[PDB]
């Protein structure tokens, strides 16, 4: 009941805050009393509480000065507590700001602070700041100390002293220290880090009572520039702990022997200021993977770090947030128990994450009212937070582009009106996105695709089979345990190319709210050719951590074909590095883990039999070419976004177009739109020709013909319709299906006595 | 005018990376900019820094940054950053790591309020350590590529302004005949031409005489033929670098092929001329197309013509080049081609002899026991599936053998539209004939359309021959 | 227990002709070398399982390394009954269902089929 949302106050007084009267009564607060307000970063202040009926019950109204004192902004939640112990200040030490005092002659205390505090009884707390108006000028002042040493009410008898050095504005600006609100896209990882760190440091008594050892080592791996360094500072500043940052490059740049001294001094000081937090930024430079151990200094520093981590103790109240790009790049010795046990994945932010990052970076800029950040977030895929900030900067630069023609470069001074008139526009963001480049495109994206069964056309048999094999063991696993039999840990999709296998996998993933991971055979093939086969184990690991998950191995037959499969690439079979590693990881999967794996192949006769053995990937399901209703569904899905002429109903065309794959459907629509598109541009060109004939002829309000996609252009498109799959390929597929089926005899001949 | 950025509340970039071909003029641009803005310019050469004794290089670098920050606004040019921070292929020694990490930490520690900009320089972005290209250190990248015909013309006019050129000098001809020539090569060409003029002027001037007549000295002046001789003797430095320009080939040079003309204009011209209305309806446009037809029928001409009609950049990549680079274990060149095609959007990436790689593996004829996929092909598929839908990077594949192309490449989403290019017909053959004889005079008795009429079944190459 | 002893031979080819010739390679040759080097007095018995006997390299079948060959037939009536009850041993079954009756007539079906 004592927590309220910050809101703008009617009164601009620095030492006065407004609260809703009933809310004050609930807290037993009276008008004019001194109240202690706690904000962010464990920073609190003292203000005079006044009743304001216009202020909402769950809201607290206060001005910019108190907002700065509490380190909070609009919309933040702050706590108000009774402070009847505020004693009248015997002496208060307050000093001004360096820039605000230039041009003022005499004692700044007498000019501003003496009348500002005389008979005003304004409460003041150590480190508080405020703005005082006097002599046509406003001068900032910072409270250095108070007689009680916590806070006091400056009375007329209070001796206010302003003898000291001026306060620097640039250094003062650091008071807007980072909090949880200044980061985004890491909500879940943010919760994990906040828990694992803030809990022991702020409330170690819980762990002591439960008699557990809170972790010391935390490892934050992810993509560069994702915001790793900001999370640690936010956490440390919110817990009020002493944060000491170490950068790997900085340590490695020091002379031999000096790096160890700096590291030991860091650990020693951090332990002194417990609770403390240590961030080994870019630990890869300090302790890179042992691919080659060249020299003696590198080994000395890595071993020094190891022994320092081991020697640290739980009672020391110290936490070491490492940082890197990929966990494998770190030396394994650091990941042993005791040094670095917990690992967190600060992965690429999702659509919502991109939205929050954009809103965070663009809050301080002069955005236009037509800015549509949701569109930018939707169109930004593979963009890390830093890339989003770069995009915003590029958009502002493009706005400047548009604003250069008026502003003369040779003039040292520029009109203020033009400066105030500048503001980015959505089109500027579009241009910046067009010019910018993503930094993360080959990283496995783990998210819940939006594809639903409605987008899946018919296939009731396959729908049922896959729902059976996957949906249940992730939706009702407890009863699977009740009966206890092992569930199927795999399945293989064989069917014609371009029939929507990935769509089926994503739809089944979405139905179960399970993460989907898309891995294509070419990527694993490249990594093996790159001698980075550990990437396969990395894929399996990631799929495991993000359980429940659906690991989709796209073009499983690509690797076998590279070796040969069944066509005879090499003299023999298909097994190789990547395939054998895949089998090894498959047999090593945990039965209790909800990591279902799906394999898609356009050629089932070439797949190595060892992969089809039970226990790895045994369920085989046939995906037929779309039938009448399936083809209707694909047609409407492809034209769902586009308008069609009323004369054209696509179900009629779907009815008779048997034997044509979904890809052919997509291309028929593409070509139909394309021909209607030529029609549209031809009409536009004829209009331009007519206008050239009669440029002065005022354009009457003639209703423009509705540019639709008509049936004639569908005819023209189907004139170039294709069917990639022949009846011979389907004959091969059904031959495989028959070799699989082999079901007869006891369909109805069995019955008990 | 930092006040503009401050009012808009944006952070102006600190790191600028100018990559390109050697001698293209990188060092001059930075000095020109700094001198025009009146800023204090301090130049650092990678060789100079690396030549200093251990510990002294770091001192010089820190002194450079410190002085530059003192004299704000300031500009720092790390000429040939490759020596300072070369790509981590092998990290040998401790000094190299010390200097690279010192540069990293110095770049990170610099602040926007410091009014400092660091123009790097190199030959290819991949040659630089990736750690430098992270956000905060070196974010913007600029491609100082080979100058175009007009660029060569301005470079020649700049270098030859101080020399005594003749009144008959035709620099436009030299620019037209200079392809793959960087600016430095053009200056060398000018010097060679002057040297050849001296050649012609040696016979009169006695070498043993310490003094030479002033009249002969004032009479010296280069002539167009001297430039021709120098060009004949000179050598280009850039020939294997992907040239990105707008070819002048037009539909008129394309003979007939109305059906294919329409199809390709549909598939390419519209999504780059009227993409806003494509978005209006919103359906995904085709991101590829494959040309199968007889050899020597003008496929590259068609691609260049469609590129010109859209004012879109054309990039010619032949299968042998990618094949050599893979054999050279530089397969990152493929990603580089895709990247370049992306930056210069709108673009038409033309993969010439797509079937060359498949044949090297075998394709359908059975080179190896199996299919055609390999390093380069698989990387091409991976980059294809990873392309941005909103980006106007259309890709065209040309193959003289369609029955050998790997089916995985023909899957929808990478390169699916297949268009047949027939042998030239009567009017097409007439067009090719006139184009080949367009430059040459013909006897009045000979009209080439009559011959073109009856010469069915003969390719454009046969016409040329 | 060397599971899928024929996997290595198939990787080299075994009898189907993976490569132009036989199946021996690094791992196989090392296995033979260790086999011939085993101590007679040591109680280290070794069992090899293969789903394809016609592809196994003959050198591995030579006496002294792995010579006893035993055929494992498909489960018969009582064997199938045993597999059925083992698979349903943990689960409750309706009183109407006795699994031995089904096991009796389901000849030619492997234990994996029973499990499924």
Q: At CA C19, angle to CA C17 and CA C20, rounded to 5? A: 75
Give ∠ CA A641-A643-A644 in degrees, rounded to 5. Answer: 125
Are A572 and C18 within 8 A, CB to CB? yes
| CA B45 – CA B57 distance, rounded (Å) | 11
Q: Is the dihedral of CA A182, A183, A188, A194 positive or negative?
A: negative
Query: Do B10 and A562 count as a contact with CB atoms less than 8 A apart?
Result: no
Q: How many helices (H) and strands (E) does chain C have?
A: 5, 0
Closest CA to A175 of A103, A97, A266: A97
Phi first, then psi, for residue B369 (nearest 5°) are -60, -25
> How long, in residues, is chain B?
465
Among B373, B410, B412, B290, CA closest to A498: B412
- B23: CB partners within 8 A, 6+ apart: B182, B183, B184, B185, B237
Residue A703 CB-half CA count within 13 A: 2
Residue B154 and residue B175: Cα distance in Å, rounded? 9
Compute CA distances A718 → A625, A667, B105, B414, whole Å.
19, 9, 61, 21
> CA-nearest residue of chain A to C23?
A572
**DSSP run (H or E) holding A88:** strand A87-88
Place of tokens 């007009």: B150
Locate B123 and state its tokens. Answer: 């030959």
Cβ contact B175:B153 at 8 Å: yes
Which structure tokens are listed for B156?
């020649």
DSSP structure class, residue B424: P
Closest C-alpha among A385, A372, A373 to residue A438: A385
Q: Which of A297, A437, A569 sits opposite B369 (nearest CB)?
A: A569
| Phi (first) and psi of residue B302, to 5 degrees | -60, -45
Q: Greatest CA separation found in chain B?
A: 83
What is the separation, in whole angstroms, between the first and last Cα of chain A? 73
| Widest CA span in chain A | 115
The C-alpha angle A591, A596, A602, rounded to 5 degrees, equals: 135
Q: In terms of Cα–Cα distance, which of A679, A669, A674, A677 is closest to A648?
A: A669
Distance CA C20, CA C5 (A): 20
Question: Rounded CA gap, B355 and B366, in Å?
Answer: 13
CA-closest candidate to residue B268, choices B252, B256, B251: B251
| Separation between Cα atoms, residue A348 and residue B191, nearest integer Å | 55
Distance CA B70, CA A201 (A): 43
Contact A571 C102 (CB under 8 A): no
C-alpha span between B156 and B163 (Å, rounded): 11
**What CA–CA distance (Å, rounded) separates A98 from A166?**
5
Report how far residue A140's alpha carbon sits from residue A116's, in angstroms, rounded to the nearest whole number: 12
DSSP run (H or E) holding A672: helix A662-693
Buried b vs exposed e over B360-398: b needs ≥16 C-beta within 10 Å? bbbbbeeeeebbbbbbbbbbbbbbbeebbeeebbbbbbb
Residue A589 CB neighbour total at 10 angstroms? 18
Question: B271-286 burial, b for 16+ CB within 10 Å, e for fewer?
Answer: bbbeeeebeebebebb
Q: How many CB atoms lie within 10 A of CB A522?
A: 24
**Chain pair A-C, CB pairs under 8 angstroms:** 39
The dihedral of CA B406, B408, B414, B420: what is its sign?
positive
* Separation in Å, CA of A613 to nearest CA in chain C: 11
Cβ–Cβ of A573/C18 closer than 8 Å? yes
Closest alpha carbon to B124 in B189, B63, B80, B190: B80
A495 is in an annotated binding site: yes
The annotation status of A486 as a binding-site residue, yes or no, is: no
Can you give the C-alpha Rg of chain C in angstroms?
20
With CB atoms and an 8 Å threshold, state whether C90 touches A614. Answer: no
Query: Which residues, including other chains, have CB under 8 Å from residue A65's CB and lie 6 or more apart?
Result: A14, A129, A130, A131
Using CB atoms, which residue from C4, C13, C102 is nearest to A571?
C13
Backbone angles phi, psi at A362, to 5 degrees: -95, 5
Beta-carbon separation of A571 and C20 below 8 A: yes
DSSP A481-514: HHH-PPPP-EEEEE--SSS-HHHHHHHHHHHTT-
Distance from CA of A560 to the nearest CA of B (A): 10
Tell me which of A674, A708, A719 to substitute to probe the interface with B (most B C-beta atoms closer than 10 Å). Answer: A674
Q: Which residues pair with A79 in a beta bridge?
A: A3, A38
Alpha-carbon distance A60 to A77, whole Å? Answer: 9
**Coil, helix or strand at residue A167:** strand
Measured distance CA(B52)–CA(B60) in Å, rounded: 9
Q: Given the structure tokens 């990052």, which residue do they identify?
A: A357
* Partner-chain residue, chosen from C17, C97, C101, that has the shortest CB–CB distance to A572: C17
On whether A311 is known to bind a ligand per the annotation, the reply is: no
Contact B23, B183 (CB under 8 A): yes
Tokens of B72: 């704000």
Half-sphere exposure of A227 (CA within 13 A, CB side): 33
Tokens of B247: 């070819």
Check: CB of residue A622 under 8 Å from CB of residue A733.
yes
Say yes or no for a CB contact (<8 Å) between C112 and A614.
yes
DSSP secondary structure letter of residue A273: T
Q: What is the dihedral of CA A425, A426, A428, A434, to 10 degrees?
A: 170
User: Between chains, do B8 and A555 touch, taking CB under 8 Å as contact?
Assistant: no
Asked if residue B442 lies in contact with residue B313, where contact means CB atoms within 8 angstroms, the answer is no
In angstroms, what CA-CA distances link B119 with A206, A262, A350, B18?
54, 32, 34, 7
How far is the alpha carbon of B218 from chain A, nearest alpha carbon, in Å?
42
Distances (CA, A) of A39 to A3, A689, B325: 10, 68, 61
Radius of gyration of chain A (CA): 34
Strand A490-494 and strand A620-622: pairing? parallel
- CA-CA distance, A557 to A606, in Å (whole number)? 7
Q: How far is the C-alpha of A155 from the C-alpha of A147, rounded, in Å?
A: 12
Question: Which residues in chain C have their CB less than 8 angstroms from residue A612's CB?
Answer: none
* Beta-carbon separation of A366 and B91 below 8 A: no
Based on DSSP, count helices (H) and strands (E) in chain A, helices before strands: 30, 23
Exp. method: cryo-EM
Q: Under an 8 A CB cutoff, do A434 and B345 touch?
A: yes
For chain C, report the end-to-end CA distance as a whole number of angstroms.
25
Q: Under an 8 Å CB criterion, which residues of C touch A? A: 4, 7, 10-13, 16-20, 90-91, 96-98, 101-102, 105-106, 112
d(C-alpha B76, C-alpha B289), whole Å:
46
- Provide the 8-state DSSP code for C59: G
Which residues, other chains included, contact B187 with Cβ-Cβ below 8 Å and sequence gap of 6+? B155, B159
Beta carbons of B125 and B85 less than 8 angstroms apart: no
Residue A379 to residue A398: CA distance in whole angstroms: 19
Which sign does the torsion angle of CA A514, A515, A520, A521 carry?
negative
Tell me whether strands A217-221 and A318-321 are parallel, antiparallel or unpaired: parallel
Backbone angles phi, psi at B171, to 5 degrees: -70, -25
d(CA B127, CA B19): 10
Calculate the CA B29 to chain-centre distance.
19
CA A671 to chain centre: 38
Nearest of A458, A455, A579, A451 to residue A516 by alpha carbon: A451
Residue with tokens 């033309």: B350
Annotated binding-site ranges of B for ADP: 20-28, 159
DSSP character at residue A627 = -
**Which DSSP letter does residue A200 get?**
H
Closest Cβ opposite residue B101 in set A249, A680, A681: A249
Phi, psi of B40 (to 5 degrees): -80, 120
Q: Which residue has the tokens 């501003």?
A: A112
DSSP codes, C7-32: HHHHHHTTTT-SSSS----HHHHHHH
Cα distances (Å, whole numbers) of residue B455 to B302, B368, B374, B442, B449: 22, 40, 42, 19, 10
Query: What are A60's strand-pairing partners?
Result: A6, A19
Query: Alpha-carbon distance A628 to A652, whole Å?
Result: 10
Cis peptide before A455 (omega within 30 of 0): no
- Is there a contact between A366 and B8 if contact means CB atoms under 8 Å apart? yes
Helix and strand numbers (H, E) in chain B are 22, 10
Q: How far apart are CA A652 and CA A668, in angstroms?
A: 14
SS3 content of chain C, % helix, strand, coil (to 5): 40, 0, 55
A345, β-bridge pairs: A221
Distance, in angstroms, between B281 CA and closest chain A CA? Answer: 5
- Binding residue positions of B: 20-28, 159, 293-301
Supply φ then ψ for residue A161, to 5 degrees: -115, 135
**In angstroms, what separates the C-alpha of B26 from chain A's closest C-alpha?**
22
Nearest CA to A670 out of B409, B270, B274, B286 is that of B286
d(CA A200, CA A209): 12
Residues of A in contact with B258 (CB under 8 A): none
Structure-block tokens of residue A80: 């108000």
A740 to chain B, closest Cα gap in Å:
26
- Subunit contact C18:A571, Cβ cutoff 8 A: yes
Nearest-neighbour CA in chain B from A521: distance (Å): 9
How far is Cα B17 from Cα B36, in angstroms, rounded to an integer? 20
Q: Which helix (H) or strand (E) holds B449?
A: helix B448-454
Q: What is the DSSP letter of A566?
A: T
Query: What tokens were used for A618?
Result: 């045994």
Nearest to B160 by CA among B183, B181, B177: B183
Interface test with B, best of A292, A393, A395, A420 (most B CBs within 10 A): A393
B partners (3+ CB pairs within 8 A) are: A
- Those residues whose C-beta lies under 8 Å from the C-beta of residue B40, and which sit 6 or more positions away, are B34, B68, B71, B72, B73, B74, B75
The residues, ordered by sequence, that sit 6+ positions from A416 with a Cβ below 8 Å of its Cβ are none
- Cβ within 8 Å, pair A677-B278: yes
């Amino acid at each position: 009941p004592n927590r309220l949302v910050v809101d703008e106050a009617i009164n601009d007084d620095n030492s006065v805050v407004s609260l809703h009267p009933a809310t004050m009564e609930k807290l037993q607060l009276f008008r004019g009393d001194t109240i202690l307000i706690k904000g962010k970063k464990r920073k609190d202040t003292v203000c005079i509480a006044l009743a304001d009926e216009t202020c909402e019950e769950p809201k607290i109204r206060m001005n910019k000065v108190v907002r700065s004192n509490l380190r909070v902004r609009l919309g933040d939640v702050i706590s108000v507590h009774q402070c009847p112990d505020v004693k009248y200040g015997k002496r208060v030490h307050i000093l001004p700001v360096d820039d605000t005092v230039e041009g003022v002659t005499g004692n700044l205390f007498d000019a501003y602070l003496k009348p500002y505090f005389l008979e005003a009884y304004r409460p003041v707390r150590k480190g508080d700041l405020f703005l005082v108006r006097g002599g046509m000028r406003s001068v900032e002042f910072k409270v250095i100390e108070t007689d009680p040493a916590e806070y006091c009410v400056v009375a007329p008898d209070t001796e206010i002293f302003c003898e000291g050095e001026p306060v620097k504005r640039e250094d003062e600006e650091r008071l807007d220290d980072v909090g949880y609100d200044d980061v985004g896209g890491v909500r879940k990882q943010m919760a994990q880090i906040r828990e694992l760190v803030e809990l022991p440091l702020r409330h170690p008594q819980l762990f002591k009572s439960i008699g557990v050892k809170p972790p010391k080592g935390i490892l934050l791996y992810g993509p560069p520039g994702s915001g790793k360094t900001l999370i640690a500072r936010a956490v440390a500043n919110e817990t009020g702990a002493f944060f000491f940052c170490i950068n790997g490059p900085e340590i490695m740049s020091k002379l031999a022997g000096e790096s160890e001294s700096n590291l030991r001094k860091a650990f020693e000081e951090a332990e002194k200021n417990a609770p403390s937090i240590i961030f080994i930024d870019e630990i890869d430079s300090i302790a890179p993977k042992r691919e080659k151990t060249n020299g003696e200094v590198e080994r000395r520093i890595v071993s020094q770090l190891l022994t320092l981590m081991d020697g640290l103790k739980s009672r020391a109240h110290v936490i070491v947030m490492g940082a890197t790009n990929r966990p494998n790049s770190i030396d394994p010795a650091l990941r042993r128990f005791g040094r670095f046990d917990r690992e967190i994945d600060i992965g690429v932010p999702d659509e919502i994450g991109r939205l929050e990052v954009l809103r965070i970076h663009t809050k301080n800029m002069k955005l236009a009212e037509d800015v549509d950040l949701e569109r930018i977030s939707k169109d930004t895929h593979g963009y890390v937070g830093a890339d989003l900030a770069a995009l915003c900067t590029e958009a502002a630069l493009q706005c400047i582009r548009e604003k250069m023609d008026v502003i003369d470069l040779e003039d040292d001074s520029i009109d203020a009106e033009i400066l105030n008139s500048m503001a980015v526009t959505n089109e500027h963001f579009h241009t910046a996105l067009g010019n910018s480049n993503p930094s993360a495109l080959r990283e496995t994206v783990v998210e819940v695709p939006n594809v639903s069964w409605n987008d899946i056309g018919g296939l009731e048999n396959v729908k049922r089979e896959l729902q059976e094999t996957v949906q249940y063991p992730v939706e009702h696993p407890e009863k699977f345990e009740k009966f206890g039999m092992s569930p199927s840990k795999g399945v293989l999709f064989y069917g014609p190319p371009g029939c929507g296998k990935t769509l089926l996998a994503k739809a089944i993933a979405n139905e179960c709210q399970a993460n989907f991971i898309s891995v294509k055979g070419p990527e694993l093939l490249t990594m093996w050719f790159g001698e980075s086969e550990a990437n396969v184990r990395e894929i399996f690991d990631k799929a495991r951590q993000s359980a429940p998950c659906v690991l989709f191995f796209d073009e499983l037959d690509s690797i076998a074909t590279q070796r040969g499969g069944g066509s005879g690439g090499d003299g023999g079979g298909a097994a190789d590095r990547v395939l054998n590693q895949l089998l090894t990881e498959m047999d090593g999967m945990n039965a209790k883990k909800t990591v279902f794996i799906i394999g898609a192949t356009n050629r089932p006769d070439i797949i190595d039999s060892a992969l089809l053995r039970p226990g790895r990937l045994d369920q085989l399901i046939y995906i037929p070419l779309p039938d009448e209703d399936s083809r209707l569904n694909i047609f409407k899905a492809a034209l769902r976004k586009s308008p069609i002429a009323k004369d054209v109903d696509i179900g009629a065309l779907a009815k008779y177009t048997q034997g044509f794959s979904g890809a052919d459907i997509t291309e028929i629509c593409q070509r139909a739109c394309k021909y209607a598109i030529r029609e549209n541009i031809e009409k536009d060109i004829e209009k331009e020709k007519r206008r050239s004939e009669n440029p002065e002829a005022m354009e009457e309000d003639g209703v423009d013909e509705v540019s639709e996609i008509k049936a004639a252009h569908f005819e023209e498109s189907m004139k170039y319709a294709r069917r990639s799959v022949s009846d011979a390929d389907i004959r091969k597929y059904q031959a495989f299906a028959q070799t699989l089926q082999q079901s007869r005899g006891f369909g109805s001949e069995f019955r008990f006595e």
